[PDB]
Design a protein around this nucleic acid. Structure first.
Ligand code: K
Ligand code: K
Ligand code: MG
Ligand code: MG
Ligand code: MG
Ligand code: MG
Ligand code: MG
Ligand code: MG
Ligand code: MG
Lengths: 167, 156, 281
RNA sequence: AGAACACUCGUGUAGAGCAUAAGGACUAAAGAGUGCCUGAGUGUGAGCACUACUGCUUGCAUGAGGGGAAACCCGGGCCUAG
RNA sequence: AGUUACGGCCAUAUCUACUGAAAAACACCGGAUCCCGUCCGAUCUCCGAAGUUAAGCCAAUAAGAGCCAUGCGAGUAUUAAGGUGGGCGACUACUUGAGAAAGCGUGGUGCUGUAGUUU
């Protein structure tokens, strides 16, 4: 087969949303354990009385992982979801996402004062050369040859983890 | 009633042309100016320092003094039925070199040859004046190939 | 939404060519080149430094109406004449190229014998010798590259200064600067003569000899060792200052015009369309 | 977790913003962020708006001046009123 | 003859699909010890050559969209001067002069400056 032209992970995005006070600190400590990083707190775009959100108030924390560490977390999570995904979960862009309701399934000890949180996982796939669209000098749009398509993303998932993609 | 601020009535003037927005081109900055040249004012709305008053837009004058990034130009104006000279300060982004002397300078180059020979051989130059177009010329015609014209088109 | 209607295309204004290509910053260029109307006969020279995956380029350029004129040029790939075997995009190779560039200039102007070289022993700007002709003057053009402490663009710039050209600079940008203390110049000298890489080579042989072979294969092929670098670089600098490279020859590669493709005639284009209708019916 | 919560990928000539009328101006910015500073210095000339008051443009000299690697810029507020 | 570095005039150069490419370059590419900067060596900064023409850059193709030119529209629309011209008016004929636009047809699809490198 032709080298280059082979799929990889470029990014895994993790986010927890918990609008309020000390809850965000309690949450942040979790992300700081699952990955060796300090996560970025994010703030409310609008003011929404019903949801209990003032504008410019912190509401969530996220962290982005790349390289080897990404492989461990993804394997750890797809197990929790029992290797089962729906055709809804894949985009026209070569990316996919799922959710988890209970952080303790990723293995960490309980500590009853910390609490129970869920988490979103989102995964972005790639082929070499993407740098052409991100570098400062001579920045250009990539060729259709080097994108990742909806079918390819499913094929990669099936191959790599032996999972089942339901219609 | 109308008002009397410094940029009154300049909605049409002092606006960019279609598909020509943005800052000036390099040629604007690399042009060198000298005292005594004739120069022509056209304001660039994107530059906010060294703008002249809108009366002077599209007028041509003569350079009196040259500074780091601006020029002083002499103009004449009628006020209270008398002639007044005016000294206008302009930044180099709002001016272009005038073409108004072009033909005269060519004519001077021809005169400069003749006026030397006129000392050696003649006594006075022929001086090569322009003349307005004269009467219609004479013509000799072969008289085959005649074309007739008629009110054939009825124009309902 | 946008690109769905004709009016989008009809009303659109294109950026200048070198902006579409992301090669030039026009706001920076204009501040750098704009003429002073009172200093007639001033003819500012830019020192242009650019770094490619393969090589370092120094050019000395004067901006004239109609197009920029190149006075002189030097490239790290030419240092192969003086026996440089390795690291053509290294911090040392940046410095060496700036040094080379300066000498070629001062030879043309015949200032070469008046303004002598000086290998990296102070951080002052070049100063006009009394009773002789003034130093050649230039200003640095770094393009779209970022300014930060220890960027390779500034190495070439110090090369040129040490070579005899007058550039104004502040020492804030060199390794060995301190926020509120004197300049530690041994750190600067260290990098110029390649200590930074020797120290990496030495580390890897203790850590992982497999990774060492992967990281430094080209060096191994030349039998260079960490110990050899100072002698290598001292020789390289001296030779630049001492010798001169042979002139280039001109040749007509005209015959390679065979490879150029040519566009279809109208007559062909029409027949091709005609055939396409008939193939369809 | 809903019409409307946070995070992403692709398109995106301005359909946004620019405290305060209306017009003009602005796109690797003049918009949004981040760093440092108090030039919202000091003497003294020449001019533009129908030109007194007022507002602005610009010259030369100085500061144990600022910001920036530097070219450059700054004696209030992007320009036209307070 | 191309490319590459720095440019000039700023779409004949744009936008969308497809296809080609000797040499040398230009790139993608392999790491983070240091200098430097990130939630994140993705970007920026540094140190490298195991791979690859798939991408970009360059070039061709398309009764392509858009842009540029020219012919026609057309002596048409409008307009300066004039008369004891006409009309209740609204407005309009004539005499000596000046003179368009949209649409629609046909052709084009970057040109050049200084230096460097490659039969
Ligand atoms: K009123
Ligand atoms: K406004
Ligand atoms: Mg008026
Ligand atoms: Mg001021
Ligand atoms: Mg102002
Ligand atoms: Mg080849
Ligand atoms: Mg480290
Ligand atoms: Mg990397
Ligand atoms: Mg190919």
């Amino acid at each position: 087969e032709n080298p280059m032209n082979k799929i990889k992970i470029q990014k895994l995005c993790l986010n927890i949303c918990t609008g309020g006070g000390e809850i965000l600190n309690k949450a942040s400590k979790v992300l700081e354990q699952l990955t060796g990083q300090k996560p970025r707190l994010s703030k409310s775009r609008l003011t929404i009385r019903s949801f209990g959100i003032r504008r410019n108030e912190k509401i969530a924390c996220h962290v982005t992982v790349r390289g080897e560490k990404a492989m461990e977390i993804l394997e750890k999570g797809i197990k929790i979801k029992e290797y089962e995904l729906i055709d809804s979960n894949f985009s026209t862009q070569g990316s996919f996402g799922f959710g988890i309701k209970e952080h303790i399934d990723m293995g960490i000890k309980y500590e009853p004062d910390v609490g129970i949180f869920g988490m979103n996982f989102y995964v972005v796939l790639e082929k070499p050369g993407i740098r052409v669209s991100k570098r400062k000098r001579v920045k250009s749009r990539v060729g259709n040859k080097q994108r990742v398509t909806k079918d390819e993303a499913k094929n990669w998932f099936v191959k790599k983890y032996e999972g089942i993609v339901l219609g | 009633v109308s008002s009397h601020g410094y940029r009154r009535q300049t909605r049409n003037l002092f606006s960019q042309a279609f598909r020509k927005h943005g800052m000036p081109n390099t040629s604007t900055y690399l042009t060198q100016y000298a005292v005594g040249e004739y120069v022509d004012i056209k304001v660039n709305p994107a530059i906010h320092k060294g703008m002249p008053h809108k009366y002077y837009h599209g007028r041509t004058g003569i350079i009196k003094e040259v500074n780091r990034g601006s020029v002083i130009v002499l103009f004449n104006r009628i006020l209270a039925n008398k002639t007044v000279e005016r000294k206008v300060i302009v930044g180099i982004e709002h001016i272009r070199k005038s073409k108004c002397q072009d033909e005269y300078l060519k004519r001077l180059e021809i005169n400069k040859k003749i006026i030397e020979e006129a000392e050696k051989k003649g006594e006075v130059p022929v001086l090569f004046k322009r003349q307005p177009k004269g009467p219609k010329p004479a013509v000799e015609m072969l008289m085959n190939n005649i074309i007739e014209l008629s009110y054939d088109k009825v124009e309902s | 939404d946008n690109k769905s209607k004709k009016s989008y295309f009809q009303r659109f204004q294109t950026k200048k060519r070198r902006r579409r290509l992301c090669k030039t910053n026009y706001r920076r260029r204009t501040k750098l080149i704009k003429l002073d109307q009172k200093n007639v006969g001033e003819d500012k020279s830019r020192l242009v430094v650019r770094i490619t995956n393969s090589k370092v380029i120094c050019q000395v350029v004067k901006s004239h109406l109609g197009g920029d004129m190149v006075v002189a040029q030097a490239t790290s790939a030419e240092l192969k004449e003086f026996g440089l075997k390795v690291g053509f995009t290294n911090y040392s190779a940046a410095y060496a190229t700036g040094l080379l560039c300066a000498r070629k200039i001062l030879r043309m102007e015949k200032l070469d014998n008046i303004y002598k070289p000086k290998f990296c022993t102070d951080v002052d700007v070049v100063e006009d010798i009394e009773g002789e002709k003034n130093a050649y003057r230039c200003y640095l053009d770094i393009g779209l590259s970022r300014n930060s402490k220890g960027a390779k663009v500034f190495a070439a710039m110090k090369g040129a200064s040490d070579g005899g050209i007058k550039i104004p600079y502040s020492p804030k940008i060199f390794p060995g600067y301190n926020k509120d203390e004197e300049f530690d110049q041994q750190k600067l000298r260290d990098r110029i003569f390649g200590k930074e890489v020797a120290n990496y080579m030495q580390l890897l042989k203790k850590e992982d000899e497999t990774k060492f072979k992967k990281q430094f294969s080209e060096y191994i092929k030349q039998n260079i060792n960490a110990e050899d670098l100072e002698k290598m670089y001292e020789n390289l600098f001296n030779s630049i200052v001492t010798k001169e490279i042979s002139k280039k020859e001109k040749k007509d590669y005209s015959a390679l015009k065979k490879y150029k493709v040519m566009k279809l005639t109208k007559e062909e284009r029409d027949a091709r369309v005609q055939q396409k209708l008939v193939e369809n019916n």
